[PDB]
Amino acid sequence: MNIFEMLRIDEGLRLKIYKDTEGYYTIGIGHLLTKSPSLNAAKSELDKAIGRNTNGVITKDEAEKLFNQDVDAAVRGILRNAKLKPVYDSLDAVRRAAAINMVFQMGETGVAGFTNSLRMLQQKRWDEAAVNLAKSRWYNQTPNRAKRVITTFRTGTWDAYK
């Protein structure tokens, strides 16, 4: 298992524009297009992202290309963030994947708001971080995914994904 296979399980793959768990137009492997309620705005963001006239449909290679860019961007957002970088550098390889998963889903600003959890993760107080991570809108809106990510931070293994 790795970050790509992990996010592919958590996000799925859809080749036509869909609404994500928040109701936002998304495509591919959790690639958010726009938070605007307009499907035309979505289609236009999609054409710009792919570089051709898509009419709301992309190929699998195209979905995987966006996915590669989004994973790369998530990692880069962590390393550029003063609150996230020292935590990420402190973690082993598996728990680093959990951090990337969170940033991918909710963005670098959202995750940087888990101040208390980040501190517990940095201190390797795994069971305590896990309890604190779950007291979140994140956990209450998407409990099955959040449980898998939290289990990954708690154990440092891929058990929740096998």
Distance (Å, whole) CA 124 – CA 52? 46
Binding of Cl ion at residue 148 (CB under 5 A)?
A: no
Binding of Cl ion at residue 151 (CB under 5 A)?
A: no
Using CB under 5 A as the binding criterion, the count of chain residues that bind Cl ion stands at 4
66 is in an annotated binding site: no
Binding of Cl ion at residue 53 (CB under 5 A)?
A: no
Tokens of 145: 């995914």
Would the CA dihedral through 136, 138, 141, 143 be positive or negative?
A: negative
Of 35-43, 74-82, 108-116, 135-143: span binding Cl ion (CB under 5 A): 135-143
Among 3, 33, 42, 49, binds Cl ion (CB under 5 A): 49
CB of 28 to Cl ion, least distance (A): 10
Question: Which amino acid is residue 137, in one-letter code?
Answer: R
Among 34, 44, 122, 142, binds Cl ion (CB under 5 A): 142
Quick one: which of 23, 18, 24, 20 has its CA closest to 10?
20
104 is in an annotated binding site: yes
Distance (Å, whole) CA 82 – CA 64? 29
Active site residues per annotation? 11, 20
Distance (Å, whole) CA 71 – CA 116? 25
Q: Are 161 and 148 in contact (CB under 8 A)?
A: yes
- Pick between residue 81 and residue 142 the one whose CB is nearest to Cl ion: 142
Tell which positions 65-104 bind Cl ion, by CB under 5 A.
none
Annotated binding site for substrate: 32, 104, 117, 132
Footprint of Cl ion (CB under 5 A):
49, 142, 144-145
